[PDB]
């Protein structure tokens, strides 16, 4: 590539893998959102919380793909595996699964950052720091806060309703 | 009728029956609304929910009557039977009765649509699709969502109060 | 499902399959868009055309999923297969592949409509007519118009540049 | 210097060298810009593209000089060598020379970043990441995109005219 | 007719013939417009040019009919013959056919003017001069200008595209 400079094949491949992970996360949140939209679940605030996160993760994937091209790397797409569950249980179960998912994404970001540092690729390192690392930390804090409030509240039915009405 | 075209006597009669069903539904919701306005019931949000539905069903009847005339059919009115109950119990009981009522109206709309299709009357079919069928589907979804939230909430007194305050 | 009425298991399954087809189409257009963003391809108008279509197809999938829930059906997600190509060649090649993809989606919509008609499900039939069928017809017309103009223009390099600058 | 802290003589010297490189780049772009303003060249969009870049590179030099003083280092200026060419040939030749120049600047920024990291000078590292590294990556991507479009277009005279009119 | 004054049967008949000629011209331009809207032709600017002319010619017919009544003559309508072609070939072919059509209309206007002069009917003469004769001269000039530019441009495919994009 005429523009490619200081951009290792290892980082290029890892960025494609991270795109897949972000799209998979978006898909998982799409599934979560529509599950809470079921008439036998019916927690609209929880549905909206996860649909927003689906959009965020898709946007993160697109930012990665834009960066791949800016550096002269080549986007390669793989199958997107379906989410791990078809039904997501309670808001508590769903929020635990979301924090698991975000921690996995954060770990992938940290692994890529370490790779970038080992490859002396400061543009990559700054990109991740600037657009992804703090967003993950803030989101995980928010989920942990939500989990604590959900747990405090669970008369589990009343608790789930109040959390959805008064927090989300 | 000088304007009547492709409008079968069977559809004409069925449209008059559906008008009666919609007015009956309006009357039922009028009864539901004022029951929740009783000082010994006193759930204003539930009263407002059903009074709004009374207005919607009356409006649906009027739309049917306007259509009857547009097609050159002749409106014929029958007695409006009183609602099935004088007292409607809890918000849960009332919402179950409302979903029963809406499903019966929806089934009548679907029967009329099938009639219209058998009579090759696409204006009727489009009219129903455009003004009634999706409105019923959306309303039934909303009632089902309400029922699920009511059920989750029912300390049944506290639950009924919170639903009325925070959802309705 | 408490709300489910006149909604066959066959339509429910077909709606889940159509969701997968729309998400796959979105993914294909995401791939198309970023390919035209490559520094060795560099046709920004073509990139924007396909990124817009990615968004449209995702939105169509979400509309289907919302409908699934409104009817009381249950969303089931499957793996999303990667797009058929990693590199998409010329704007001409890409627009031919897009018209192939849209025709396949349109055929799936028509198959589902026929199913809905056979199952006497007019809500489904109206839903498809109202939100999908005319959008597909308009989009295919636009692509065909684009293809004709691309073909007229292809000094193939000059042609591709002018189309991107003056049409897109 | 009373304020100097964690600022190595090696970085101080390298920052002065980078100032010279940025001023040299500004001078090169000044030459490029006025060449395209010649009546026997006459490509105003190309002239404007390079005059803008002259300003950008001068501004980058000034930002470096401001930083030098903020850290307590001492600006030292050297002769500014004249640009490598007196006449710059075609827009294609000029854009190739510009990408060569930007890659050399980017490599100098990366070398300085590596120096800063080896000297454990995170302020320097952040400064470069924040103000220079991403700007270079974006600019090189844009030049590469321009080069690809120029190449696609070159009836070379017609191509050069159209690029200047429709892209620049 | 109580109002009829200085309005010969010969002019009355000729005005009815000219109405037919203008409606025929409108129909021809309707055909031209939709031909350029075909997906295998796809020149939207050319389609718009001819659809506008269809409207102009219809309006001219209506102005003639209004005049017929103002003078106390009696509008008589004849069949409108279909346009001379089903497919109109290239923009060049179409613009040549349009100039042929406009010249025929102009000649009919000039013949009617001569008739009006021979019948000493200055109202008719002024009407034609004021509303039709200069409009035809301007339109024919514009078509001739278009033809010259089309001809200059025809790599005939590229030429047709550029004319549609940059002139129409």
Coordinates of N, CA and C in Angstrom, one line a residue, chain D residues 5-143:
Chain D
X5 N 12.2 20.1 33.4 CA 12.0 18.9 34.2 C 11.7 17.7 33.3
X6 N 12.5 16.6 33.5 CA 12.3 15.4 32.7 C 12.4 15.7 31.2
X7 N 13.3 16.7 30.8 CA 13.4 17.0 29.3 C 14.8 16.9 28.9
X8 N 15.1 15.8 28.2 CA 16.5 15.4 27.9 C 17.1 16.3 26.9
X9 N 18.4 16.4 26.9 CA 19.1 17.2 25.8 C 18.9 16.5 24.5
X10 N 18.7 15.2 24.5 CA 18.5 14.5 23.2 C 17.2 14.9 22.6
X11 N 16.1 15.0 23.4 CA 14.8 15.3 22.8 C 14.8 16.8 22.4
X12 N 15.4 17.6 23.3 CA 15.6 19.1 22.9 C 16.2 19.2 21.5
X13 N 17.3 18.5 21.3 CA 18.0 18.6 20.0 C 17.1 18.1 18.8
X14 N 16.4 17.0 19.1 CA 15.6 16.4 18.1 C 14.4 17.3 17.8
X15 N 13.9 18.0 18.8 CA 12.8 18.9 18.5 C 13.2 20.0 17.6
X16 N 14.4 20.6 17.9 CA 15.0 21.6 16.9 C 15.2 21.1 15.5
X17 N 15.6 19.8 15.4 CA 15.8 19.3 14.0 C 14.4 19.1 13.4
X18 N 13.4 18.7 14.2 CA 12.0 18.5 13.6 C 11.4 19.9 13.2
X19 N 11.7 20.9 13.9 CA 11.3 22.3 13.5 C 11.9 22.6 12.1
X20 N 13.1 22.3 11.9 CA 13.8 22.6 10.6 C 13.1 21.8 9.5
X21 N 12.8 20.5 9.8 CA 12.1 19.6 8.8 C 10.8 20.2 8.5
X22 N 10.0 20.7 9.5 CA 8.7 21.2 9.2 C 8.8 22.5 8.4
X23 N 9.7 23.4 8.7 CA 9.9 24.6 8.0 C 10.3 24.3 6.5
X24 N 11.2 23.4 6.4 CA 11.6 22.9 5.0 C 10.4 22.4 4.2
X25 N 9.6 21.6 4.9 CA 8.4 21.1 4.3 C 7.4 22.3 3.9
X26 N 7.3 23.3 4.8 CA 6.5 24.5 4.4 C 7.0 25.2 3.2
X27 N 8.3 25.3 3.1 CA 9.0 26.0 2.0 C 8.8 25.2 0.7
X28 N 8.9 23.8 0.8 CA 8.6 23.0 -0.4 C 7.2 23.2 -0.9
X29 N 6.2 23.3 0.0 CA 4.8 23.4 -0.4 C 4.6 24.8 -0.9
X30 N 5.3 25.8 -0.4 CA 5.2 27.2 -1.0 C 5.7 27.2 -2.5
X31 N 6.8 26.5 -2.7 CA 7.3 26.3 -4.1 C 6.3 25.6 -4.9
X32 N 5.8 24.4 -4.5 CA 4.7 23.7 -5.2 C 3.5 24.6 -5.5
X33 N 3.0 25.3 -4.5 CA 1.9 26.2 -4.7 C 2.1 27.2 -5.9
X34 N 3.2 27.9 -5.8 CA 3.4 28.9 -6.8 C 3.7 28.4 -8.2
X35 N 4.3 27.1 -8.2 CA 4.5 26.5 -9.5 C 3.1 26.3 -10.2
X36 N 2.1 25.8 -9.5 CA 0.8 25.6 -10.1 C 0.0 26.9 -10.4
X37 N 0.5 28.0 -9.9 CA 0.0 29.3 -10.2 C 0.7 29.9 -11.5
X38 N 1.7 29.3 -12.0 CA 2.3 29.7 -13.3 C 1.3 29.8 -14.4
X39 N 1.3 30.8 -15.3 CA 0.3 30.9 -16.4 C 0.4 29.7 -17.3
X40 N 1.6 29.0 -17.4 CA 1.8 27.9 -18.3 C 1.5 26.5 -17.6
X41 N 1.0 26.6 -16.4 CA 0.6 25.4 -15.6 C -0.9 25.6 -15.2
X42 N -1.2 26.7 -14.4 CA -2.6 27.2 -14.3 C -3.5 26.1 -13.8
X43 N -3.2 25.6 -12.6 CA -4.2 24.7 -12.0 C -4.4 25.2 -10.6
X44 N -5.4 26.1 -10.5 CA -5.6 26.9 -9.3 C -6.0 26.0 -8.0
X45 N -6.8 24.9 -8.3 CA -7.1 24.0 -7.1 C -5.9 23.3 -6.6
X46 N -4.9 23.0 -7.4 CA -3.7 22.4 -7.0 C -2.8 23.4 -6.3
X47 N -2.7 24.6 -6.8 CA -2.0 25.7 -6.1 C -2.6 25.9 -4.7
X48 N -3.9 25.9 -4.6 CA -4.6 26.1 -3.2 C -4.3 25.0 -2.3
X49 N -4.3 23.8 -2.8 CA -4.1 22.5 -2.0 C -2.7 22.7 -1.4
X50 N -1.7 23.0 -2.2 CA -0.3 23.1 -1.6 C -0.1 24.3 -0.8
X51 N -0.7 25.5 -1.1 CA -0.5 26.6 -0.3 C -1.1 26.4 1.1
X52 N -2.2 25.7 1.2 CA -2.8 25.3 2.5 C -1.8 24.5 3.3
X53 N -1.2 23.5 2.6 CA -0.3 22.6 3.3 C 1.0 23.4 3.7
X54 N 1.4 24.4 3.0 CA 2.5 25.3 3.4 C 2.2 25.9 4.8
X55 N 1.0 26.4 4.9 CA 0.5 27.0 6.1 C 0.5 26.0 7.3
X56 N -0.1 24.8 7.0 CA -0.1 23.7 8.0 C 1.2 23.4 8.6
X57 N 2.2 23.2 7.7 CA 3.5 22.8 8.1 C 4.2 24.0 8.9
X58 N 4.0 25.2 8.5 CA 4.5 26.3 9.3 C 3.9 26.3 10.7
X59 N 2.6 26.1 10.8 CA 1.9 26.0 12.0 C 2.4 24.9 12.9
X60 N 2.8 23.8 12.3 CA 3.3 22.6 13.0 C 4.7 23.0 13.6
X61 N 5.5 23.7 12.8 CA 6.8 24.2 13.4 C 6.6 25.1 14.5
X62 N 5.7 26.1 14.5 CA 5.4 26.9 15.6 C 4.9 26.2 16.8
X63 N 4.1 25.2 16.6 CA 3.6 24.4 17.8 C 4.8 23.7 18.5
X64 N 5.7 23.2 17.7 CA 6.9 22.6 18.2 C 7.8 23.6 19.0
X65 N 7.9 24.8 18.4 CA 8.7 25.8 19.1 C 8.0 26.3 20.4
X66 N 6.7 26.4 20.4 CA 6.0 26.7 21.6 C 6.2 25.7 22.7
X67 N 6.2 24.4 22.3 CA 6.5 23.3 23.2 C 7.9 23.3 23.7
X68 N 8.9 23.5 22.9 CA 10.3 23.6 23.3 C 10.3 24.6 24.4
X69 N 9.8 25.8 24.2 CA 9.8 26.8 25.3 C 9.0 26.4 26.6
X70 N 7.9 25.7 26.4 CA 7.1 25.3 27.5 C 7.9 24.3 28.4
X71 N 8.7 23.5 27.8 CA 9.6 22.5 28.5 C 10.9 23.1 29.0
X72 N 11.2 24.3 28.6 CA 12.5 24.9 29.1 C 13.7 24.6 28.2
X73 N 13.4 24.0 27.0 CA 14.4 23.8 26.0 C 14.7 25.1 25.3
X74 N 15.7 25.1 24.4 CA 16.1 26.4 23.8 C 16.0 26.1 22.3
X75 N 15.2 26.9 21.6 CA 15.0 26.9 20.2 C 16.4 27.3 19.5
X76 N 16.8 26.4 18.6 CA 18.0 26.8 17.8 C 17.6 26.6 16.3
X77 N 17.8 27.6 15.5 CA 17.4 27.6 14.1 C 18.6 27.3 13.2
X78 N 18.4 26.6 12.1 CA 19.4 26.3 11.2 C 19.0 26.9 9.8
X79 N 19.9 26.9 8.8 CA 19.5 27.3 7.5 C 18.4 26.4 7.0
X80 N 17.5 27.0 6.2 CA 16.4 26.2 5.6 C 16.9 25.9 4.1
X81 N 17.1 24.7 3.8 CA 17.5 24.3 2.5 C 16.4 24.5 1.5
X82 N 16.7 25.0 0.3 CA 15.7 25.2 -0.7 C 15.1 23.8 -1.1
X83 N 13.9 23.9 -1.7 CA 13.2 22.7 -2.1 C 14.0 21.9 -3.1
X84 N 13.7 20.6 -3.2 CA 14.5 19.7 -4.1 C 14.4 20.0 -5.5
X85 N 13.3 20.7 -5.9 CA 13.0 20.9 -7.3 C 12.6 22.4 -7.6
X86 N 12.9 22.9 -8.8 CA 12.4 24.2 -9.1 C 11.1 24.1 -9.9
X87 N 10.9 23.0 -10.6 CA 9.6 22.8 -11.4 C 9.1 21.5 -11.0
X88 N 7.8 21.3 -10.9 CA 7.3 20.1 -10.2 C 6.5 19.2 -11.2
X89 N 6.5 19.5 -12.5 CA 5.9 18.6 -13.5 C 4.4 18.6 -13.4
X90 N 3.9 17.4 -13.4 CA 2.4 17.2 -13.5 C 1.8 17.2 -12.1
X91 N 0.5 17.3 -12.0 CA -0.2 17.1 -10.6 C 0.2 15.8 -10.1
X92 N 0.2 14.7 -10.9 CA 0.7 13.4 -10.5 C 2.1 13.5 -9.9
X93 N 3.0 14.1 -10.6 CA 4.4 14.1 -10.1 C 4.4 14.9 -8.7
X94 N 3.6 16.0 -8.6 CA 3.6 16.8 -7.4 C 3.0 16.1 -6.2
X95 N 1.9 15.3 -6.5 CA 1.3 14.6 -5.4 C 2.2 13.4 -4.9
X96 N 2.9 12.8 -5.9 CA 3.9 11.8 -5.4 C 5.0 12.4 -4.6
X97 N 5.5 13.6 -5.0 CA 6.5 14.2 -4.2 C 6.0 14.6 -2.8
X98 N 4.7 15.1 -2.7 CA 4.1 15.4 -1.5 C 4.0 14.2 -0.5
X99 N 3.6 13.0 -1.1 CA 3.5 11.9 -0.2 C 4.9 11.4 0.3
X100 N 5.9 11.5 -0.6 CA 7.3 11.3 -0.1 C 7.6 12.2 1.0
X101 N 7.4 13.5 0.9 CA 7.7 14.4 1.9 C 6.9 14.1 3.2
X102 N 5.6 13.9 3.2 CA 4.8 13.6 4.4 C 5.3 12.3 5.1
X103 N 5.7 11.3 4.3 CA 6.2 10.1 4.9 C 7.5 10.3 5.6
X104 N 8.3 11.2 5.1 CA 9.6 11.5 5.8 C 9.3 12.3 7.1
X105 N 8.3 13.2 7.0 CA 8.0 13.9 8.3 C 7.4 12.9 9.3
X106 N 6.5 12.0 8.8 CA 5.9 11.0 9.7 C 7.0 10.2 10.3
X107 N 7.9 9.7 9.5 CA 9.0 8.9 10.1 C 9.8 9.7 11.2
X108 N 10.1 11.0 10.9 CA 10.7 11.8 11.9 C 9.9 11.9 13.2
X109 N 8.6 12.0 13.1 CA 7.7 12.1 14.2 C 7.8 10.8 15.0
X110 N 7.8 9.7 14.3 CA 7.9 8.4 14.9 C 9.2 8.1 15.6
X111 N 10.3 8.6 15.0 CA 11.6 8.5 15.6 C 11.7 9.3 16.9
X112 N 11.1 10.5 16.9 CA 11.1 11.4 18.1 C 10.2 10.8 19.2
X113 N 9.1 10.2 18.8 CA 8.2 9.5 19.7 C 9.0 8.3 20.4
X114 N 9.8 7.6 19.6 CA 10.5 6.4 20.1 C 11.6 7.0 21.1
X115 N 12.2 8.1 20.7 CA 13.2 8.7 21.6 C 12.5 9.1 22.9
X116 N 11.4 9.8 22.8 CA 10.6 10.2 24.0 C 10.3 9.0 24.9
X117 N 9.8 7.9 24.3 CA 9.5 6.7 25.1 C 10.8 6.2 25.8
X118 N 11.9 6.1 25.1 CA 13.2 5.6 25.6 C 13.7 6.5 26.8
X119 N 13.4 7.8 26.7 CA 13.7 8.8 27.7 C 12.7 8.9 28.8
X120 N 11.6 8.1 28.7 CA 10.5 8.1 29.7 C 10.0 9.6 29.8
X121 N 9.6 10.2 28.7 CA 9.2 11.6 28.6 C 7.7 11.5 28.1
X122 N 6.7 11.2 29.0 CA 5.4 11.0 28.4 C 4.7 12.3 27.9
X123 N 5.2 13.5 28.5 CA 4.6 14.7 27.9 C 4.9 14.8 26.5
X124 N 6.1 14.6 26.1 CA 6.5 14.6 24.7 C 5.7 13.6 23.9
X125 N 5.7 12.4 24.3 CA 4.9 11.4 23.6 C 3.5 11.8 23.4
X126 N 2.8 12.3 24.4 CA 1.4 12.7 24.3 C 1.3 13.9 23.4
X127 N 2.2 14.8 23.4 CA 2.2 16.0 22.6 C 2.2 15.6 21.1
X128 N 3.1 14.6 20.8 CA 3.2 14.2 19.4 C 2.0 13.5 19.0
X129 N 1.4 12.6 19.9 CA 0.3 11.8 19.5 C -0.9 12.7 19.3
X130 N -1.1 13.7 20.1 CA -2.2 14.6 20.1 C -2.2 15.6 19.0
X131 N -1.1 16.1 18.6 CA -1.0 17.2 17.6 C -0.4 16.8 16.2
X132 N 0.2 15.7 16.0 CA 1.0 15.5 14.8 C 0.8 14.1 14.2
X133 N 0.8 13.1 15.1 CA 0.7 11.7 14.5 C -0.6 11.5 13.8
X134 N -1.8 11.8 14.3 CA -3.0 11.5 13.6 C -3.2 12.5 12.4
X135 N -2.7 13.7 12.6 CA -2.8 14.6 11.4 C -2.0 14.1 10.2
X136 N -0.8 13.5 10.5 CA 0.0 12.9 9.4 C -0.7 11.7 8.8
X137 N -1.3 10.8 9.6 CA -2.0 9.7 9.1 C -3.2 10.1 8.2
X138 N -4.0 11.1 8.7 CA -5.1 11.6 7.9 C -4.6 12.2 6.5
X139 N -3.6 13.0 6.6 CA -3.1 13.7 5.4 C -2.5 12.7 4.4
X140 N -1.8 11.7 4.8 CA -1.2 10.7 4.0 C -2.3 9.9 3.3
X141 N -3.4 9.6 4.0 CA -4.6 8.9 3.5 C -5.2 9.7 2.4
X142 N -5.4 11.0 2.6 CA -6.0 11.9 1.7 C -5.1 12.0 0.4
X143 N -3.8 12.1 0.6 CA -2.9 12.2 -0.6 C -2.9 10.9 -1.4

